[PDB]
């Protein structure tokens, strides 16, 4: 089982879950902002 | 404050060193006789001499003295053999290259013939001093780094005086032998071909010259700060790492995020210094032969700035208002 960082498989799964959860909220906020911007000044 | 190590506190003197030897027998051609200077010894070594005399050095010295005397005697004769006027106008006189009408043929002695004879003696002198620098490493069983670094500057020397005039088709493209007259040549060369600021290889040469001076301030200062740990004995630090090298590396690592080694900093220094005349010569060789106006070249290649405001003093003030009337 290859590992350069010293982490285990279970630790990596636990970290990735929270990372993805925090990455989805940022995308949702960006999507809402882009929709508001398109409604004020369309670009397409 | 603490001692700073710029001047030696106390000097000691012993028997004069005559140098190392090997099977090549360097002693046979070394002069006997040495001196000591206590004024210099406040900064560096006090011993003066001895020197090695081979054939390359003797030929270089003789042919360089000949060049100097052809120029000096021509300068003296231009003034009517008047010594006080010769002294008065020393910085202004020169031995002028030939006129453009003669091409690459041999000009009259009054109009560049002595300039060509003297240029042939300076050429011979310089190439002989380089063969001496190569032979001495070979005889000392060392590397040839000094000779290569000297050839780097000889490249720009030859480009300025030999190669570019031949490719341009006139001996009139060479540099005059004078103090002020040679500086007038620099300004006129820059003006004639647009603006030499906009030659990219001139900019690269300036980059490497600035970098070489920044590196001796950094290297000299760094070595003087670790001399309390024996840091000026660099070769033994290379062969056996000590705390001086470690502290010197860690200072720059903590300062700017990367560092060098005791041996590897000298490669950095060697390359920055060597790269200045190479890029300079490449830049000079491209002028007139390829590019005739460097500012128009910059406009063509889109790195020439543009200005919006107007030109003229009366766009900003009044002649009466500048005098206080």
């Amino acid at each position: 089982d290859l590992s350069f960082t010293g982490l285990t498989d279970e630790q990596a799964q636990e970290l990735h879950s929270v990372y993805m959860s925090g990455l989805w909220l940022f995308s949702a906020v960006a999507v809402v902002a882009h929709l508001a911007t398109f409604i004020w000044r369309p670009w397409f | 404050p603490e001692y700073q190590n710029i001047f030696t506190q106390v000097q000691v003197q012993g028997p004069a060193e005559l140098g190392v030897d090997n099977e090549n027998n360097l002693t046979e051609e070394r002069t006997t006789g040495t001196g000591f200077s206590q004024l210099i010894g406040w900064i560096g070594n006090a011993q003066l001499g001895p020197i090695y005399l081979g054939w390359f050095g003797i030929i270089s010295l003789v042919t360089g003295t000949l060049w100097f005397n052809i120029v000096g005697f021509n300068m003296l004769s231009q003034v009517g053999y008047s010594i006080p006027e010769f002294i008065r106008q020393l910085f202004w006189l020169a031995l002028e290259p030939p006129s453009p009408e003669y091409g690459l043929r041999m000009p009259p002695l009054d109009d560049g013939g002595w300039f060509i004879i003297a240029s042939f003696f300076l050429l011979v002198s310089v190439i002989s001093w380089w063969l001496r620098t190569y032979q001495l490493a070979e005889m000392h069983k060392m590397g040839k780094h000094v000779a290569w670094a000297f050839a780097a500057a000889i490249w720009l020397f030859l480009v300025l005086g030999l190669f570019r005039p031949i490719l341009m088709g006139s001996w009139s493209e060479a540099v005059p032998y004078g103090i002020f007259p040679h500086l007038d040549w620099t300004t006129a060369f820059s003006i004639r071909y647009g603006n030499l600021y906009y030659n990219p290889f001139h900019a690269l040469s300036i980059v490497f010259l600035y970098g070489s001076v920044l590196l001796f301030a950094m290297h000299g200062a760094t070595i003087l700060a670790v001399t309390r740990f024996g840091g000026d004995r660099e070769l033994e630090q290379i062969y056996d790492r000590g705390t001086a090298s470690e502290r010197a590396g860690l200072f720059w690592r903590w300062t700017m995020g990367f560092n060098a080694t005791m041996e590897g900093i000298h490669r950095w220094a060697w390359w920055f210094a060597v790269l200045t005349p190479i890029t300079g010569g490449i830049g000079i060789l491209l002028t007139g032969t390829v590019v005739d106006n460097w500012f128009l070249w910059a406009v063509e290649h889109n790195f020439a700035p543009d200005y919006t405001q107007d030109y003229g003093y009366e766009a900003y003030t009044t002649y009466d208002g500048f005098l206080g009337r």
Binding site: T5 | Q9, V10, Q11, V12, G14, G41, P200, G242, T243
Partner: protein, 255 residues
């Protein structure tokens, strides 16, 4: 003169060729300077996950003089210290360490020395390079003020002993060390001071780095006629550590 295509002429070709050459030269120069101190480690002595963008160089060999052998780099760290009295002040990386006992006696911080070879450095003839002046044929003080016989004053204003001799480098004709005989009140025997840490005046010789009470713990040479590289490193580091550890006010912020 003509162009090859668009605005591309001989000057552009030369410029791009120089760009490529300079990129290769930067790679070579950065790789050449990685023969000491690698691979990288973390604050617990283990190999670090990150090793940077440049790979390590191949090996070079140096043939040493006087039958000392060969040196191959990059290789193992032979100058590594074994048991350092240091303590972590944090659980992760990036924070300083604290000495466990006396920092000056344990050789840590600005008092750290590197484990060099336990032999003196030689000159061209195979002889020790640094020799006391009382055994150096033909040498004398030719300029400046002679410090032999003057008293030595410490950083707190105490007289600790007298200068007895000077140790010189005969090949380069330079003074390297001053030899001090201690008064019985401040210790016993003889000690050395490197020349770059003293100020020689007309009536005294000043050493500001350490105090009087620190003069008995200066490391001592084994032989009275020669000094090895390891002893040199331990003596110089001891004096260097006093600039920070002599007084508690030298370590705290000066504000």
């Amino acid at each position: 003169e003509e162009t090859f295509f668009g605005n591309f002429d001989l000057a552009s070709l030369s410029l791009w060729l120089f760009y490529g050459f300079f990129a290769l030269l930067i790679y070579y120069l950065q790789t050449e300077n990685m023969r000491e101190g690698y691979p990288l480690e973390d604050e617990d002595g283990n190999t670090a996950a990150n090793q940077g963008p440049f790979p390590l160089p191949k090996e070079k060999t140096f043939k040493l003089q006087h039958g000392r052998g060969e040196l191959t780099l990059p290789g193992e760290d032979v100058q590594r210290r074994d048991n350092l009295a240091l303590r972590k002040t944090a659980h992760g990386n990036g924070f300083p360490m604290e000495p466990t006992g006396d920092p000056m006696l344990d050789g840590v911080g600005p008092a750290s020395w590197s484990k060099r070879r336990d032999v003196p450095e030689l000159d061209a003839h195979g002889h020790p390079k640094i020799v006391p002046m009382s055994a150096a044929e033909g040498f004398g003080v030719s300029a400046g003020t002679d410090p032999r016989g003057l008293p030595v004053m410490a950083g707190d204003g105490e007289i600790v002993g007298l200068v007895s001799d000077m140790w010189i480098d005969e090949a380069e004709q330079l003074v390297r060390y001053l030899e001090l005989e201690l008064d019985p009140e401040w210790g016993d025997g003889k000690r050395l001071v490197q020349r770059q840490m003293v100020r020689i005046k007309s009536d005294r010789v000043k050493v500001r780095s350490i105090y009087g009470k620190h003069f008995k713990n200066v490391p001592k040479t084994k032989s009275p006629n020669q000094v090895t590289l390891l002893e040199e490193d331990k003596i110089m580091a001891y004096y260097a550590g006093g600039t920070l550890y002599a007084d508690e006010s030298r370590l705290e912020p000066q504000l």
